[PDB]
Amino acid sequence: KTFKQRRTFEQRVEDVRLIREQHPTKIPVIIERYKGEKQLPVLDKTKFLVPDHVNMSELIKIIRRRLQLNANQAFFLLVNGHSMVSVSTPISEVYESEKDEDGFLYMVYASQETF
Numbered sequence: 001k002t003f004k005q006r007r008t009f010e011q012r013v014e015d016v017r018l019i020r021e022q023h024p025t026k027i028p029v030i031i032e033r034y035k036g037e038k039q040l041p042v043l044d045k046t047k048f049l050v051p052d053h054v055n056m057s058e059l060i061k062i063i064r065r066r067l068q069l070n071a072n073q074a075f076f077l078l079v080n081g082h083s084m085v086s087v088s089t090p091i092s093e094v095y096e097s098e099k100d101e102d103g104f105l106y107m108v109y110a111s112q113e114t115f
C-alpha cells in the first residue's frame with residue numbers, strides 16, 4: 001500500500017538518480033496520507049517534483065490547493081517522521097537535512113496534530 005512497500009530500496013534509489021538527470025532543479029518528495037486519517041481525501045499521486053526555491057509554507061498551500069481544502073479545514077504535514085521546526089526554510093535546505101537514504105523526502109499529512 002505505502003510507497004516504500006511498493007518499490008525496492010534499489011528502485012527508489014534509481015528513480016531519484018533519474019529525477020537528478022531529467023529534473024535537476026526539483027526536490028523529489030513523497031507525500032502520503034496518514035494511514036489513520038478519516039477526514040482529508042487522498043492525493044491523486046504520491047511523487048511530486050517540488051521547485052527547490054519554494055519554502056515549506058508555500059508547499060503546504062500547494063497541497064491544500066491540490067486536496068481542494070477550504071479555509072477552516074485543518075492540515076498537518078510531518079517531514080521525515082516529525083513536525084517541521086519552521087515553515088520559512090527553503091525546501092532545498094530541508095531536503096539536505098531531512099532526506100531519506102533512498103534520496104526521497106518523505107511527508108505525511110493528517111487533520112489532527114496527534115497522528
Ligand SMILES: CN(C(=O)Cn1cc(Br)cn1)C1CC1
Nearest residue numbers: 047048049050051059062063
Ligand atoms: C511541482 N509540483 C507538482 O505539482 C508535482 N509535479 C510537477 C512535476 Br513536472 C511532476 N510532479 C508542486 C508540488 C510543487
Ligand SMILES: [Cl-]
Nearest residue numbers: 023024025026
Ligand atoms: Cl529541472
